[PDB]
Amino acid sequence: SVKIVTSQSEFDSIISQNELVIVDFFAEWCGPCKRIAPFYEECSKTYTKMVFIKVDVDEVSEVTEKENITSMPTFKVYKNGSSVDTLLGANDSALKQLIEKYAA
Numbered sequence: 142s143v144k145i146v147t148s149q150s151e152f153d154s155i156i157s158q159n160e161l162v163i164v165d166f167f168a169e170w171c172g173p174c175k176r177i178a179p180f181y182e183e184c185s186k187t188y189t190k191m192v193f194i195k196v197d198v199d200e201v202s203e204v205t206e207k208e209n210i211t212s213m214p215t216f217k218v219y220k221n222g223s224s225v226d227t228l229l230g231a232n233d234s235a236l237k238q239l240i241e242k243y244a245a
Contacts, residue, residue, distance in 0.1 A: 143178070143185055144194040149201040152194075157222035159192045161243055165231070166196055166205070167214045174214065177231030184240050191218070191244035218243050 143165075146152045156162050165181065167174040185193050198205045198213070208217065208224060216228035216236055220243075228239045 143181060144192075146194050146196050147200055149203045149207075152196045152201060152204050153207070153222075155192065155194050156219045160221065161190070161225070162192045162194065162219040162222075163188075163216065163240060163244065164194050164196050164219070165214065165216050166198060166208065166210055167231075168198055171214060173231035177214070177233065177236070180233030180236070184236065184244075188240055188244035191240065216240075 144155070146155055148154075152164075155164075165174065165177070181193070196204055198210060204210075212229055214231045216231065216239065217224050218226045218239065226239060226243065228236055
């Protein structure tokens, strides 16, 4: 069950209240989020060791600046409340290896 956080501190909170956290920084006017969600769902039930959340850039622009988000869609995994890895382009297979690497 991918988690959607609508707060800036709540976003950062999720990052710090867990060892490893994976977030899909995305936009609502994009299609990949919808196309990447189906695979993301599978990843969420096996990779449950890793916490999955969703943070939009429009609701909390401050979040974008906090993580220096330049490209999109971007998938980043956070360790000890810090950025640990980045994945460009919402790809089921690409995230598969990225999510599997730290989560699997």
